[PDB]
């Protein structure tokens, strides 16, 4: 596992030689050299161990919250390429001298976007639970997906690698759980038709048996009655089926293209 070749107690040696030259004692010169390179390498190596320590902390939070492994990915490959290119460095190199600062900047930006990831992730996931709990209505789930939509939009300002397919994995899970809720609503329509599922309103169909010029008939027709019952079915389909399918990206401003109603 990740650790660095450094010892803090070496700053204790630096403290002791910065005291005892002042107390008049002539010290050996290789100790002065070792405390001098300790003086050069002291903020840089502790900047390395906070980068490594916060790296293993954010490693733990992405293996725990692995659900969003797809929203770290370009930053993850930047920090993995930075540690893979920081394989080749040594303590004699003056190439570490911007490098640890670029590493700590990417540690901080990684921390920034993994905590923004946490906030907007958990607000999206509890809004997925708000799809799972509230009432069987087109408008209610529409502002649910609008807030999830603009949450995805503000996460798309950050522009990671494989951001949009994570959104499509969410939308197919929405589509499956909406199939479960549509099964609840249609079974509620089935039971309310015979005298979490919502409230189906299955209206009375008015028929008058009718004589016009010695001909007993029925007006309105029974095919129209069966037709009207299928209108109340297709309107009870319309609650879940015309809930708008979120795209993988909705920053496609220059795209007026490939828009069918099963994608809409």
């Amino acid at each position: 596992k990740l650790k660095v070749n450094f010892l803090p107690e070496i700053i204790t040696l630096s403290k002791e030689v910065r005291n005892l030259k002042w107390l008049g004692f002539r010290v050996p010169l290789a100790i002065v050299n070792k405390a001098h390179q300790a003086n050069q390498l002291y903020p840089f190596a502790i900047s390395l161990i906070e980068s490594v320590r916060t790296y293993e902390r954010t490693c733990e939070k992405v293996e725990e919250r692995n659900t969003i492994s797809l929203l770290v990915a370009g930053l993850k490959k930047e920090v993995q390429a930075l540690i893979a290119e920081g394989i080749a460095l040594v303590w004699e190199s003056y190439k570490l001298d911007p490098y640890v600062q670029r590493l700590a900047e990417t540690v901080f930006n990684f921390q920034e976007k993994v905590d923004d990831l946490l906030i907007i992730e958990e607000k999206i996931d509890l809004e997925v639970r708000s799809l799972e709990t509230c009432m069987y209505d087109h408008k209610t789930f529409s502002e649910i997906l609008n807030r999830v939509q603009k949450a995805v939009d503000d996460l798309n300002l950050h522009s990671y690698s494989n951001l949009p397919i994570w959104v499509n994995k969410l939308d197919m899970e929405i589509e499956r759980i909406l199939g479960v809720r549509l099964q609840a609503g249609l079974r509620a329509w089935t039971q309310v038709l015979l005298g979490p599922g919502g409230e189906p309103k299955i209206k009375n169909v008015v028929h008058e048996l009718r004589i016009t010029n010695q001909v007993i008939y029925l007006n309105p027709p029974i095919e129209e009655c069966r037709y009207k019952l299928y209108q109340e079915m297709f309107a009870w389909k319309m609650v879940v089926l015309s809930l708008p399918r979120i795209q993988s990206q909705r920053y496609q401003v220059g795209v007026h293209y490939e828009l069918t109603e099963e994608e809409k």
């Binding site: 596992k1 790296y55 492994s69 797809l70 770290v72 370009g74 993850k76 394989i87 490939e258």
Partner: peptide, 28 residues
């Protein structure tokens, strides 16, 4: 012309990247 979808561009995780770099230093 459909939106012909790209391959699974992905980040390998720190466990498998650390086993990869452990193999890279085991070669070194």
């Amino acid at each position: 012309r459909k939106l012909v979808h790209d391959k699974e561009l992905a980040a390998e995780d720190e466990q498998v990247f650390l086993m990869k770099q452990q193999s890279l230093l085991a070669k070194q």
